[PDB]
Amino acid sequence: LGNCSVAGWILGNPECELLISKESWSYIVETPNPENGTCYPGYFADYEELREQLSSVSSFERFEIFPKESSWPNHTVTGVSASCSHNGKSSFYRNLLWLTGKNGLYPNLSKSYANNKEKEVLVLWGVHHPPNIGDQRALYHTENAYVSVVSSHYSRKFTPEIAKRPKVRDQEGRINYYWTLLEPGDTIIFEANGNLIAPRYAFALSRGFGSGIITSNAPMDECDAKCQTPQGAINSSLPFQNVHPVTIGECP
């Protein structure tokens, strides 16, 4: 995973863009204090639970759940944030989209999705709490707003509260990212009126056993072993070790 956190990587943080193109793997790695994590500030809803999703997923393919081109004709998507910089030119997350009002309107949208991928699929989004009512009107053309997300087992109602909050990355507003899983044959409906961060890259998942999440510091080279721990790997047939309790793979 390199520098970005799991929260950063699942959201396509613009610092591990290079992490996009690997979809099959063995076990996550994490620098203990990842800095370039969630670039736009906020509060990942149920962060730990989703962290536990990835502890056992074998492989997963990403796909444009709603392609940026044709999904939002009446809206505009090219919205960046100077905090979430990249090489100095302002940019946003890969997997998310900033549906801001276009041509002076922000028409109501209902961009549903009927899952037919025959596997559990993962979906992300967020609702942007501006720090200031004037921000809200200049960005979404409505005092209040509501967001609804619906499945055959999941539904909840989003009202983005307005409140000035302390400086976080020299930018006062915040989002809450959310997430959910869809069983095969389930349809998810995105009813919204204002303050959305629509999904662009939903993750089609495939679970398993034998993987895990660790937190190491050591570099990586061309070993060949079977039992890796935060302090390295083991290449012996002895049955007990005192290297570190947490293990990966079949281990003594």
Epitope: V80, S81, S83, G104, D135, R137, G173
Partner: antibody, heavy 123, light 109 residues
């Protein structure tokens, strides 16, 4: 293309109340910030105050509690209230659209304008 | 509270030369300043917004620049129809508080 025109010319006696309207062509009053602009002859331009397209008001503090603005609920016209009109503030009165564009999610520096032809409210 | 003191209060030049006008803020307004044009009698049209960009289909004549407190205008090349009065405009974001500056006239010699 939104094109705008004001209404309600004439005079006013001191301490009376000024009320002149402003109706919208081209598009409507649905979206943007709609603004009232006055300019004393041979001087600069102050700003009376303006109201959101939804109908939330913001008035110039230096000239408080003499003004009432809104859209006429036909959402095609809007008017200026001015109670106790002193013979001082004589001006050409401008109806101006103020629309906010942006680049990032921070600098909303874009506060564009398009306005009508000015109303000669001579006292 | 925020005010836009100006200088010079007037500039005169022979049509075809360089021109430069500036406005000074009473505080630190970052970049949300925009300047205008107003021919004798006619209502004004916006020219330069964010003190950075020309308006829609405005000739090569104009350019607004600077950042921070003092912003400056430049006329790389002028035309006699441009003899008019130019302004400046600040718009504080949340409490909208639009306030202009002086506004000066560009006559000739």
């Amino acid at each position: 293309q939104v094109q705008l025109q004001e209404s309600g010319p004439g005079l006013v006696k001191p301490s009376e109340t000024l009320s002149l309207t402003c109706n919208v062509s081209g598009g409507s009053i649905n979206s943007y910030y709609w603004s009232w602009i006055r300019q004393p002859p041979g001087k600069g331009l102050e700003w009376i105050g303006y109201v959101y397209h939804s109908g939330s008001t913001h008035y110039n503090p230096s000239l408080n509690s003499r003004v009432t603005i809104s859209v006429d609920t036909s959402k095609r016209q809007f008017s200026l209230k001015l109670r106790s009109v002193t013979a001082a503030d004589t001006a050409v009165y401008y109806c101006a659209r103020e629309k906010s564009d942006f680049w990032t999610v921070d600098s909303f520096f874009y506060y564009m304008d398009v306005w009508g032809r000015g109303t000669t409210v001579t006292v | 509270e925020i005010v836009l003191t100006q200088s010079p209060a007037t500039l005169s030049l022979s049509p075809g030369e360089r021109a430069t006008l500036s406005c000074r803020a009473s505080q630190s307004v970052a970049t949300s300043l925009a300047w205008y044009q107003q021919k004798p009698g006619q209502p004004p049209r916006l020219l330069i917004y964010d003190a950075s960009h020309r308006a829609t289909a405005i000739p090569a004549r104009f350019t607004g620049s600077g950042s921070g407190t003092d912003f400056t205008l430049t006329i790389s090349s002028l035309e006699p129809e441009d003899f008019a009065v130019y302004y400046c405009q600040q718009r504080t974001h949340w409490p909208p508080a639009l306030t202009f500056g002086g506004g000066t006239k560009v006559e000739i010699k």
